[PDB]
Structure formats: C-alpha cells, structure tokens
Amino acid sequence: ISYLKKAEKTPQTETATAQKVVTEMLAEIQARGKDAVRQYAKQLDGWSGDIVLTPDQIREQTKDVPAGVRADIDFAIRQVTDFALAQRESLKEFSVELHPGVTAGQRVLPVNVVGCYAPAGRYAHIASAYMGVATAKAAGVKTVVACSSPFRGQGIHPHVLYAFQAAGADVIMALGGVQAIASMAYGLFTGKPADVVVGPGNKFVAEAKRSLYGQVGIDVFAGPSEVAVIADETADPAIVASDLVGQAEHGHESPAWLFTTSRDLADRVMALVPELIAKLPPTARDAATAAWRDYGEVILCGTREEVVEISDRYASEALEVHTADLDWWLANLTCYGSLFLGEETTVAFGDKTSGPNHVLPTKGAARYSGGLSVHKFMKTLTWQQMTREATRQIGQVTARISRLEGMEAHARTADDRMAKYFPNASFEMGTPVEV
Amino acid sequence: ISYLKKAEKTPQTETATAQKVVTEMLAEIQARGKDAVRQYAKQLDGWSGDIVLTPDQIREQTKDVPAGVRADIDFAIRQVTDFALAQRESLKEFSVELHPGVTAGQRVLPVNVVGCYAPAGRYAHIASAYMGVATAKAAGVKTVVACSSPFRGQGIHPHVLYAFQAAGADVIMALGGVQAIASMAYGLFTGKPADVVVGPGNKFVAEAKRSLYGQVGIDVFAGPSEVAVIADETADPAIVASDLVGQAEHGHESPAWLFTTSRDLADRVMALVPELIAKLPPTARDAATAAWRDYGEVILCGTREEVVEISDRYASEALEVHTADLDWWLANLTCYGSLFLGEETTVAFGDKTSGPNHVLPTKGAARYSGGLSVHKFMKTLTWQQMTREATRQIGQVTARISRLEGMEAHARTADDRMAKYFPNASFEMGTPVEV
Numbered sequence A, B: 001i002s003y004l005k006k007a008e009k010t011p012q013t014e015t016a017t018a019q020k021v022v023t024e025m026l027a028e029i030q031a032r033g034k035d036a037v038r039q040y041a042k043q044l045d046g047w048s049g050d051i052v053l054t055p056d057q058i059r060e061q062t063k064d065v066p067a068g069v070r071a072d073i074d075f076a077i078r079q080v081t082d083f084a085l086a087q088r089e090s091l092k093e094f095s096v097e098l099h100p101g102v103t104a105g106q107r108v109l110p111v112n113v114v115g116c117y118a119p120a121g122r123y124a125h126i127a128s129a130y131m132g133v134a135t136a137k138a139a140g141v142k143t144v145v146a147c148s149s150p151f152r153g154q155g156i157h158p159h160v161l162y163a164f165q166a167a168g169a170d171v172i173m174a175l176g177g178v179q180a181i182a183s184m185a186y187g188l189f190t191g192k193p194a195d196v197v198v199g200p201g202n203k204f205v206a207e208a209k210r211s212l213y214g215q216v217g218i219d220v221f222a223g224p225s226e227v228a229v230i231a232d233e234t235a236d237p238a239i240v241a242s243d244l245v246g247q248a249e250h251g252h253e254s255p256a257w258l259f260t261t262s263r264d265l266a267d268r269v270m271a272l273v274p275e276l277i278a279k280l281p282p283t284a285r286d287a288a289t290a291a292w293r294d295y296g297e298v299i300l301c302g303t304r305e306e307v308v309e310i311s312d313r314y315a316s317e318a319l320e321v322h323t324a325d326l327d328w329w330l331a332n333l334t335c336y337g338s339l340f341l342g343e344e345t346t347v348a349f350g351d352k353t354s355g356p357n358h359v360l361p362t363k364g365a366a367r368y369s370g371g372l373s374v375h376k377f378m379k380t381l382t383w384q385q386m387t388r389e390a391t392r393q394i395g396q397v398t399a400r401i402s403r404l405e406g407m408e409a410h411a412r413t414a415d416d417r418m419a420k421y422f423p424n425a426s427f428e429m430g431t432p433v434e435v
Ligand SMILES: NC(=O)C1=CN([C@@H]2O[C@H](COP(=O)(O)OP(=O)(O)OC[C@H]3O[C@@H](n4cnc5c(N)ncnc54)[C@H](O)[C@@H]3O)[C@@H](O)[C@H]2O)C=CC1
Pocket: A021, A044, A045, A118, A119, A120, A121, A122, A123, A125, A128, A149, A175, A176, A177, A178, A200, A201, A202, A203, A204, A205, A221, A222, A223, A224, A225, A226, A250, A251, A254, A317, A358, A359, A360, A361, A362
C-alpha cells in the first residue's frame, strides 16, 4: 500500500471552525429566537424579505419555469419516489410468540413533521430539494417544512422552489445555513417543530444538524461531498478522472480518492485530473483546483483485499467500482454511503435521477449509517402482551433479577401480580432489598 | 383535560447541568486522552485499578456466581436474543429495476465495533448488560466492547460481569459515566474505536452519547427512566400504583405519568402511591419520594381520543395500557418507546426478561426513534448498476439538471459517457456553464 498522492487536509481539518461558529449561532438563536434568525439572514445572506413563502409567492416565483425543466425534475422525482417506496416495503411489521403466552411485535410508524434543507451557495441544489421532500412523502409523513438559502443575492432559486413544491412540501421558507436548521428544529416561523431534520450542506449546516440531534432526529451527517473510485487495469483513466473532478467541483473541502491496483491507471489519472480541471469554467475550476490539491488522494494497493481494507477505512460517501468481477466487490465492501458498480453508472447520475438518495454520510459516518431514506422517517417501536400463565415464569424471573440489582419496587410489581393472579402459588421471588 | 397532579420538574429541567458537565469532561478527554479518563475514574468513582479486565480477572470475579442466578440471566438472554433475531428478519435486502437497465438495491450490513454501557450507581443494571451485548451479537457485530461503572467499592458488579460475558462481550472495562462513553467512542485502552455506542444511563451518560453523535452512531437518547400508564374504569388502582412506583424508584429525576378517563381510578392511585413509597427500603424510598413529588403527573381526560393526544405529546419511554379494547389503542397510539398492552405484562417484565429491548427513548425522543434494537447496528446502504442503454435517458437528464444547478463538471461525466457509449447520438445535454 503506497500513497501516490497524499492530501494536506481531510474532512476533519475544518471541524473546529465549524463547531465554533455553530456553538455561537445556536446560543444566540436559543436565547433570541426569531429575531436572531432574521438578523443572521440579513447579515449572512443579505435577506430582509419575508421568510415563510405564501402560496402566491411560490406560484409567482415559479410561473416562468419552462415545461422541459419541469419534465426533467418530475422524472427525477418519480425515480426517487419509486426507489423510496421499494425501501419502505423492505421493513415490515410483525408479531411473534416468545415464552408461551408472551406475544411481542414491532410497529413501524412515520414521524409527524419533517424539516428538509436544500443547500444553495456556490450552486443551487435542485436535486437535494426533491431528495428530502419526495422521500418524506414516500414515507407517509404528514407535514414537510422545506428551506433553501437565498441564492446569488436573491431569493430561493426558482428551480429549487419548483422541486420542493412538486415533491409535496407543505411549507417553504427562504432560509439558509445554521439559522435554517435551527428554525426547523425549533419550529420558528411555522409553529411546527420538526421531529426529524434532514438534508445536505456545508460544514456549518452539517455541524448544526449534528449539534441539534436529540432536540430532533436526523438522517445523517451529510457535509461537503466526497467520492472514491476503486479501479483495476480494465478501468478507463479518462472516465475515472472525469468522475473525480465531477465531485471535486462541489467546493474547496471536497475530497476525491482513487484506490487502485494499477500504477499505470493511477499515473494516467494523476496527469488527466489537473488537465480536466483547467478546462472547467471559473467557479468550478476554483473549487476543484483547491479540492484536488488539498484533499485529493491516490493509493496504490497490491491486492483486492488491501483495496477493500483501505476503502472500508475511508468509508466514502460515494464509491464507484470500475473493475472486473463486480459481484466480489458488492459482496466484500462494507463501508460506503452509496455504491456505483461498473463504469456505466456514475455519482452524478445518483446525484440527480438514478433513484437512490444522494443525501449521504460524510467524514466517516458511513461506518455506522447509510444515507437519507424512508428508514430515517420510520420509527420501529415494540409492543407486548401476556397471558396470566406467562407471568408465572416472567414474574418470578423479573422479581429475582430486580432484587439482585437492588430494585425492590420493580420486584413488587411482579409480587403484586403473582399474589393477584395466583394467590396459592409460592415461588422464590428473591430476598427483599433492605438498604 | 385536567391535571389532578402537576409536576414542578420535567425531563428538560436538568438539561443545563448535564450539558455543562459533559462539555467540560469531553474537552478534557479530547485534550488529555487516557490520563483524563484515569483521573475521572479515580475522582468520580474512587477507582484506581486496571480498566480493561483480563480473562483471568473475569473468571475470578464471576467464579462464585450461583447456578440459580446464571439460569435466570441465561433465560433472559434467550428471550432478548429470540426477539432480536425476529427483528433482524424484519429488515430485508432487495434489488429492483427502476428506469429500464437501471438496477438498484439495498444492502443491510452490521457495523464492525459496538460499545455497550451498562449503568451502575444507585442500582447495578444487570439486565442492561445483556440488553446491549446480546442484541449486538444477534445483529452479527464481530467486536463488542462493554463498560460498566465500578459499583460499591469493587469493580464491575459480578452479576453485570456475568451478563456481559454470557451475552458474548469481547472486551470488558471497569469504567463509568461520561468517561466510559468517551473511551468507547475514541477507542481508548482497547485501540478499537466504536462505530456505534449504545446503552442507558443518568443525564450525563445520555448527554455524552448525544454530544458524541457523529464521531459514533448511537441507539437513542436513553436517560432517566420514564413510565406512563393509560387506564380506564376497568383498571386496578393497586396495580397501576405499584407500576408507577416501580419506575419512580429509579431516581429523583424519573417521571411517572397517569393518563385516565376515570376519576375514581385517579383518586385511589394518588392516595396509594405515597403509601407504597413509604413501605420501600431507604434507597428506593428516597428516589421515589422526590421523583413522584417533583416529576409525577396525573391527567384526567374525557375521551380516548384526548388520552391518545396527550400520550402522543408526552411520548413516554414506556407505556402501559390498562383498558378495554386493546386493539384500538395499538392502532391509534403513535409516540412511545415500548408498549405494554393489558395488565398482565408490566414495564419491570420488559426491563428484565420479556424479550423486547428495555433501552428506550426518553425526553421526547420517542417522537423520532424506537429503542435499542438490531436495527441500530444494521446499516442500510444502496447500490446500483446500469446498462449502457440506461445512460441515454439517465445521462441526458443528469447533464441538464446539473447545468441548471451550475454544476458543469457533473454534467461532463454524463457528456463523456454519451460520447464514449453513443458517439452518434444527439441529445440536449444543456447549455454549458460559463461562470
Ligand atoms: N453529503 C451530501 O449528501 C451532500 C453534500 N453537499 C454539500 O453541500 C455543500 C453546499 O455548500 P454551500 O454552497 O455553501 O451551501 P449551503 O446551503 O450549505 O450554505 C449556505 C448557507 O451557509 C451560510 N454560511 C456560509 N458560510 C458561513 C459562515 N462562515 N458562517 C455562517 N454561516 C455561513 C450562508 O449564509 C447560507 O445561509 C457543499 O459542500 C456540497 O458538497 C451537497 C449535496 C449533497
């Protein structure tokens, strides 16, 4: 295992800056509520307008959105919705018998209110807007509040707004960043605090969601976008290089990783990536140049197993696999947000319209979670019921363990049932706690 | 809706104290690592022994655990495992065709390393020990690190230790509180950082997990225990009262709630609870007296619908239902951690040996999450693969949407595939970005 390109910075590098800003802003917002948010909206995003859009404003701001644009977004919404409904079917309710007379089961219930964030800064994240909202509706969530940042010194990008509306948002707000996340968490402006807040964003957005976990549920830590490509000698260096640059344009902090067993592939890609970046237009060129320099990495490995080991350690948001024997890679990789098998599909496809959600774990979160999905909006709750007969065993065990732990009042709830249901039975219910 | 008893305190009252302590302690542990943890163990828990238990120590400390105790714990481990294995079956892998030629699927994979906390302070939480570890093993997790607080002069309570060992823990540490949670998160002492940290504890433990979310996944915010009872005129006040007192003994901060449509039931319960508490031994009496006084509430409602409304808003960790027509309540209740239908079962049974997990959401977390389960250790990841033909539709939509967003490099990954796979095709790929 050898690093042909090592990065100066990682997803961890900017953590402290993000956490500093978020701690300050959240303190302010907790203390000063809506006034703090309007002021942050003013000073950060130059926004003095109304925050909650009326139906009139939405209609007005999207009236001129062309039919061909709407057709593309509607098509994407359908793909996302279809995959979401398939995922919903994968998680089932059930009941079982355990000890005789003990019935237990699992209920699967949607949350009531979701807040969805769609980012807008360098780019306007049209696709993010339907990724959150369409998924929440597919999960059967009753109320969906959606926010996106005022873009390029104006309001919500009209195509983001269209995405939100067509995906089924009930409330739309022109709010960005930390103040958006906090507003949705606390129910500022709407009076409807979210049960779950979802959606991608820069390091401040992702840290704000992470800090507010508890107050709300979340999808996943979904910060500056990442990409890894696993490639063997069959891979096409021109396509690999193209794919790396594709995510590098997200911004200065987006890492692009190449893991390969072919030095010839690595070398060609390392030559091609700067060339591809130089041909980009200004904003993308600016982002990708910094990202590739500071965060880009290339790792040469000797075997497939070493690639797997490295990939799993990196736990990339998105992982492309351009190799032979794709079944082996599906069977063996274990840590990634979203997997793209073979050359034909690619991350940008997943980003816009493949179907599976693009809101995905960054900064190692793929070690413990997949991305936004209907699963993040379903609660899996347990229920149980017993016969009186079942409590003969369950009760005596409960009383004895409870007493071993020191929990006398717990044990008495079992004693009381035994005395009531079976006044003639006599069991070892454990030595009463005296201290 | 009338408050026959209104609480002066709620689960939210103590949040500020918890956060202050946790912020300080986590800062110290980030700064000083193992040195801070050894210092906290000495100063908070009076422990200056080794932290990681050796195989010989475990054998030696569990050698005189009687056969009767072992049989009860083993029976409980069986019930938890049985229900866990059933829950595991409820979440399926799948693949589907979306747009023709687009294959997308869901992989369900266990995390690599889990940290389990079993509390020990007022009481020694034997059941908590198997709740975490047995569930992790049922999920297929290969490495389980297990911690419990030094209890009453010694290291880990011997019965907690037996539970950890019999449930299948790989590493066991004598370590409590925030320092335990932190150590498992950062892999201190073991060199094995957890992917997910689970387990219940006091307000500091729960806040530490919440604050470390991101570094690790977690189960849920599982702080000071809560109980709610729904009762109608059919309920037995002696049992209801016993059950409320059962959970109140957990500590000064444990809320016990009664929601009822019967005033007579309410009055008898309110008379009984004090009498029952007075009959408890000192530790439990002290805890329950304060909990009932400060946090206990009793609410009278006119209709079942009002009871559901109020129950859903309280979102209790554990919810007993002593009513007629239990199917209606199962159909209509939406916010609770774990549901106990009918009088026969009770929270204490679920705590020790019913089967469903007892590590459950507090402080309103049941609005967005169920308790600890195999689901908290299973990652739901997505994969996809495409034919070249599929990329004709998917690629053109990607390129157009990308360019609408301003993301030119994204669009170029589609352009490059269209040129390679279909050089003679002419699609609208969008106006290239110039800015
Ligand atoms: N992980 C995932 O699934 C996805 C991640 N992303 C990432 O989302 C990010 C989007 O970033 P942006 O374009 O900035 O949009 P954004 O919407 O995340 O950020 C814009 C907001 O952040 C605020 N902000 C910016 N700098 C600030 C500062 N220093 N202090 C306080 N507030 C500040 C702005 O005022 C505005 O309110 C990119 O890094 C992109 O890669 C995008 C899509 C999916």
